[PDB]
Design a protein around this nucleic acid. Structure first.
Lengths: 113, 114
DNA sequence: GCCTATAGGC
DNA sequence: GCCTATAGGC
DNA sequence: GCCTATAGGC
DNA sequence: GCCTATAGGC
């Protein structure tokens, strides 16, 4: 569970946030040669080590290409950050994150693991 | 020349960079009712207050709406940063930055303002 | 991909 | 009126 | 060959 | 919009 090296603003100073089982780091894929999809979507909830301060990192593109990315800062509001992460996970897969163990792929939606 | 408030990671820790005339802050517009374009593009070269460290901020979207944005870090390489800023200005308007007190709008490219 | 307005479906 | 899928512009 | 407009996928 | 691969004009 290393912080995405592409997140230059945090690779030195922060960790992926966890609570036992629940490690808020995940990689998504949708390959579909009918529509020429071969694309990823990474999501990471990050806490700083120095201060109690949270961020959500998202990064996406065609497999192989460094794509685009977003870093959303939450300043200690862990709930904001879990919401963003979980909402986005749902948006892209049509599965709830808490329901991760029993993941059911959907047509035209991202796949996990 | 305040830092865009939407740049949460640098509002209050940094300033728009200037050198005499040249203030590296600018807003672009392209309206074209035929194709329903009504969009902006902001660009800002920023120096940190406490250290010699530069960044380019870009932010764009439909007029009124939130949009997307990018922050490009340059460390103390001010030339990298001027390049990025100026290149991007050229990409979007078809006019060079330094020679455009006399700015000439072109069809299907962004316009400046004052 | 992003954001968000809008049309169709309860 | 509400919810979500669709696509319209960025 | 160089350079800029376009187009495809994200 | 981005990043890129290719098409097209001088």
């Amino acid at each position: 569970a290393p912080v995405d090296p592409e997140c230059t603003a945090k690779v030195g100073k922060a960790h992926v946030y966890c609570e036992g089982n629940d490690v808020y780091d995940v990689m998504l894929n949708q390959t579909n040669l009918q529509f020429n999809n071969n694309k990823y979507y990474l999501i990471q909830l990050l806490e700083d080590d120095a201060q109690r301060n949270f961020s959500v990192w998202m990064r996406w593109g065609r497999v192989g290409k460094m794509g685009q990315h977003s870093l959303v800062a939450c300043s200690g509001n862990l709930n904001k950050a879990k919401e963003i992460f979980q909402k986005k996970f749902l948006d892209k897969t049509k599965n709830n994150w808490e329901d991760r163990e029993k993941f059911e792929k959907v047509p035209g939606k991202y796949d996990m693991l």
